[PDB]
Point group: C3
Chain length 135, copies 3
């Protein structure tokens, strides 16, 4: 009864690990020796992109589960997949040029807002179930 | 279900975190910091670092929030959760004005976090001694 | 029952807060004035280590719970403990020298992939009988 949410969650976790791998590969390709994170423009775009993704990850997960638990698992699950796609655009877009990140960024933040909305409605509706009203 | 209050707080805090990210985006435009760079303007640098410290601790807050709410008391955890959200509001805007103006909101939100950790640890412990060692 | 998962989760959250404390201590030891995060090489090692940990934390939590819920709580719990240990090695290793991070890094990523695997099997096996 959370099996769909669980699946999306494992998919997104693999995406985030994939992004971390690219930064590791970029460190070798452009000779950026740890702990440094600057010194090659190509590396800096890859690093910053991965950083923005990893920052937003827990926000996506919460919003995903609250929507799926309190509104509809199937609908949240589908939005979740489109979000995973949006960041795929964002990451690879940025990596090529800072201005190519904007599509994937707008898509994934649109989805996140909708998930927030659905989660808020469902939680509200669900709160009225201890006032016995179901709208 | 018996997580409805936790769920509400969680959605509120997630909105706060997205709001912080928006401010960094606005600051990038106001102080002309060309991506992927995050240095150059001191005003931008304070806003960026503040949002970074918030986003780092966010998953730690969520775990501690739910463990406290699940294994100790949902209503008590829920209330602390709201005050934490407020403390982070002070921290972020405080830091944005001056590096030393962050300290109030910092102490508040980390105090709460420690208490939530405490409650979570007790409840989990009590539940563990009741479930594998038959001691409540 | 999720009491074992709950315990590991609170343990790891304490580790993460501990790492953040060390960065705070490093700011004072090497005079790195906020909001700056560069200058002292040793500080940059401590900071980057804590940053790699805090990035991967939500990934560990999700995979930990999915494995524990859909595969086995006791087995996931044990792997969870080994991950916590691997991160302990990573952090302190890296703090001394970038090349001392490698052991704790391999250990913790081994665990993470297995947790992902177990979670995926359990969810699948789970979905195979509707």
């Amino acid at each position: 009864n959370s099996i769909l949410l669980a699946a999306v969650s494992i998919l997104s976790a693999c995406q985030q690990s994939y992004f971390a791998l690219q930064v590791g590969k970029a460190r070798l390709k452009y000779k950026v020796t740890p702990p440094a994170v600057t010194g090659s423009p190509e590396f800096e775009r890859v690093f910053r992109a991965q950083q923005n993704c990893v920052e937003f990850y827990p926000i996506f997960i919460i919003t995903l589960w609250m929507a799926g638990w309190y509104f509809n698992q199937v609908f949240a699950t589908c939005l979740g997949l489109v979000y995973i796609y949006g960041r795929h655009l964002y990451f690879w877009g940025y990596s090529e040029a800072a201005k190519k990140r904007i599509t994937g960024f707008r898509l994934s933040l649109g989805i996140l807002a909708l998930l927030t909305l659905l989660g808020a409605l469902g939680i509200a509706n669900s709160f009225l179930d201890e006032y016995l009203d179901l709208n």
